[PDB]
Each structure stands twice: as C-alpha cells, then as structure tokens.
Amino acid sequence: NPKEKIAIRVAQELKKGQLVNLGIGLPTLVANYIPKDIHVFFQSSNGIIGMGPAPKEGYENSDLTNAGASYITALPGAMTFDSAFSFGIIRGGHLDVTVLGGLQVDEEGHLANWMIPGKMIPGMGGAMDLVTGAKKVIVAMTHTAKGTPKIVKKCTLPLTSIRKVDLIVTELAVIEPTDEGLLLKEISKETTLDEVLKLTEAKLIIADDLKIFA
C-alpha cells in the first residue's frame, strides 16, 4: 500500500503523449495506474520506444525484454535501436519524464540512488544519464529508511548527478525542489504536517495551498 500510494500519485503527473522511462522497482508500478484517458509511450533503456506490459504465457520473445531482462511486449509503432541511439534519446532531452527510485534526495534536489558504500555496488547503469538528461525527473521513494529520513540536508551517499530533480513523491508528501529549497506542495491523506516535518531532516518550505493526496 505505501508503494501503491506512491505509484498512484506519480501516475497523475503524466501527460498525454509523453515519452516516459520507469526505473526498475518501485517506479514500474506507475504503469499500473495510468488514467484510462491518458496515453503515453514507454522507453526502456536497453533499446525500445513503445514498451508494453509483460506478454501472456506463450507470447514471450527471447530478444524482447525490459532493462531487467524480464520479458515484455512491444506495442504497435514501437521502435527498437542500439544503445547509443537509446542514450541519445535520454541524454539529448527527448525523454519527457523519468521516474526513478531513491536512496536520498537533498535540499539542492540532488538524488543519490545507485550505490550504498559498503553494502551494495550494482553500478549506475543508465541512472546518471537519465537524471542528467530527462526533461522532468520524478523521484518515487518511501519516505524513511526504517525511520531514518531520506530527504536530507546534503546527500551523504554518492550522487547520481548534480541536476535538480523536479519532484519527490513519498507515501507522505509531494515535494518540488525549487530555487530556494524544497517546497512541500502536498501532504498525504492519512498523515499530518507535524509527522512529515519530524521525518524530514531536510529544511522544508511549506506552500500556502497545501493539498491532500500522497
């Protein structure tokens, strides 16, 4: 449910006709909650525009997968391409939206999401390119790492890029990094402002019109 609250909230940020990339893990559930009236196109960085849901059993193709080697479908009008073309889309500003997971976001909007020193070394993959390049970056992230705040003054984990992410979404809050700090724009139903401030080590500017959602 806490990941479902996040996926639903990110899905409402998606506009008609956008090219959208979803990181593996939490962000991929965003695909489950697109409004029926909104049609978008999914890019998987291993080389497809026009990715679609997993195939029914028997309809698998060994050469068609997502960025996790898991079987997908391709929709009519899909294009597949090499990895230089894939990241020319990403790094060159033709990817409208990327939704990625997060370990920390800081009050400069800097995201850390590809390494924990000493615990996990999976490598960055394409995260650095996606964050550096996407028109809009949306971070989708449980608010606390077993209580520990993940929205912090300065990232202590290694940075994925110095670009300012455009939106944070947790089970508790919607925060838009801005020129003068992190702006809390919405608060969860089922939470209180006092609770969010306690669980946020980072400084939050509070918006005049604060809303209820995720």
């Binding site: 998987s44 960085s45 291993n46 080389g47 497809i48 193709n61 060994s62 050469d63 068609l64 997968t65 960025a67 996790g68 080697a69 391709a74 597949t80 391409f81 090499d82 990895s83 230089a84 894939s86 990241f87 990403i90 790094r91 996990m120 070394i121 999976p122 490598g123 960055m124 993959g125 394409g126 995260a127 650095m128 390119d129 550096t132 390049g133 290694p158 940075l159 994925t160 890029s161 110095i162």
Partner: protein, 213 residues
Amino acid sequence: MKVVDISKINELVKEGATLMIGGFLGVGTPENIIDEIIRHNISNLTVIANDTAFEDRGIGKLVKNKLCKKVIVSHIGTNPETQRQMIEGTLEVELVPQGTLAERIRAAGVGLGGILTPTGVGTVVEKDKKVIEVEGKKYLLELPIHADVALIKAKKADYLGNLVYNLTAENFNPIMALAAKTVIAEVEEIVPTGTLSPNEIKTPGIIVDYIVT
C-alpha cells in the same frame, strides 16, 4: 569465407585479449562463442560490455570461471560473483555510465578522439577526467575505448556478411562491431544476399571478419 567453425575461436581470441562482447543482461549475447572461450580456458580477459549478466548466463559465465582480469561495464548488480571478485581484489571493475560507454565505444568505431558529456559531472565519475566547459556548461571528456576482438550477436547474416538485429537484442552489438580490430559475429540464420534490404541492414558485411553457426 567469413563463416568458420566455432573451434576457430582459439586462433582468434588471444590470452589477455581485450574483448568487446555484446549483450544486455544476456539478451543479444554470443553464448556459443562464450562457451568456446570457456571450453579452452582463454583467460586474463579485459571484457568491455554493458554488464556481467548473471552467474549462469552469457558474460557471467566468463566471470564464474575467472577468465576476466578486468571488466569495463556499466552494471554488475545482477551477478553476485562479479561483486565478490571485485571486492576480493582479483577483478578490476571500471564502472562507466551506460550512455558514456555507448559513446566511448562509438568514438573508437567512428574515429573520434573523444566526446564531451554532462553525464557523471559532479559524481565519482568525474575523477581523473579532464573537465571542459563550452558556453559555461561543464562536461567530462570521455575517451575512446578500443578492443582486440568484438564478439557480437545478430539475428541474420546474408552471404556477404551484412547483419540485422532483432528488437532489444541489438543494444551494444552494432556499436562494438565498428570499434574492435577484429569482429566475430555469432548469428542464428544465414540468408541469401538480397534477403536483407539496403534500407534494413544495420552492420555492413565489410566490417564483419568472421561469422559463426
């Protein structure tokens, strides 16, 4: 005469070879060429790829048999044994942002001294990289990656060695085919010349030196 038996791998892949190997987590990898390299224990490889796939698959089989001195890849999280060998110090791991690796390999293949990219700026990836500002944005200078042999996978080759790929098996293969000094292409089907259109071919036969099964 481009098509040869898999046995001929041992004449082509030297000990200590620096190799480019295509494939995204084993999708679009030359598994047969991989198996031959293991059969004859060609080792001390520098392997340039997107990842080390899985312990049971593709490039990850090379790592399990410890035939790699070094891997230059963007991702290793799906292969816990690549993680262990990195840590125990037996395997150098040079992590490269996937898009930088695509363009570094490409730079070698198309004859560029390097490319400037904003990816990695301000991260550990800026270490020991020249930084260049052009109209006030900074970029890392990223440099061409060469290799002795490119071991690529493709769907079909015609009699002249022209290649086409299939869906997300393309990824890094056509790019590696242009960067290495020798290119060996594992393919699934051999088709008559004229089956692959001039408008469909993605890798010309002229740059493919050898082909297998």
